């Protein structure tokens, strides 16, 4: 089920990579049997980094960034939202 994680930047940034489509919207695809528009996802987690310690895992799909729904969002929208705070990030994620 979707869950919320709070992450504070360390020396190393947040310690994850985000990957997904450049465009908006597109073909529906279910995640764990729940229907969604395309979702950006976590493509890497730095061992021992902030995201790792918050329990973010490779493959986690990103549903919200800083309380903003990012279902179907562009990669730029998600990157810019991740950058909204000076040091804190809140994500709603879905593990696969």
């Amino acid at each position: 089920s979707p869950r919320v994680v709070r992450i504070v930047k360390s020396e190393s940034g947040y310690g994850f990579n985000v990957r997904g489509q450049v465009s908006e919207g597109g073909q529906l695809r279910s995640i764990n049997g729940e229907l969604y528009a395309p979702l950006q996802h976590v493509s890497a987690v730095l061992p021992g980094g902030a995201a790792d310690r918050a329990g973010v895992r490779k493959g986690d799909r990103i549903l919200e960034v800083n309380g903003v729904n990012v279902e179907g969002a562009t990669h730029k929208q998600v990157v810019d939202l991740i950058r909204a705070g000076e040091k804190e990030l809140i994500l709603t994620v879905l593990s696969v």
Partner: peptide, 7 residues
């Protein structure tokens, strides 16, 4: 077309 960004 997908992009990856280091955060």
């Amino acid at each position: 077309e997908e992009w990856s960004t280091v955060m």
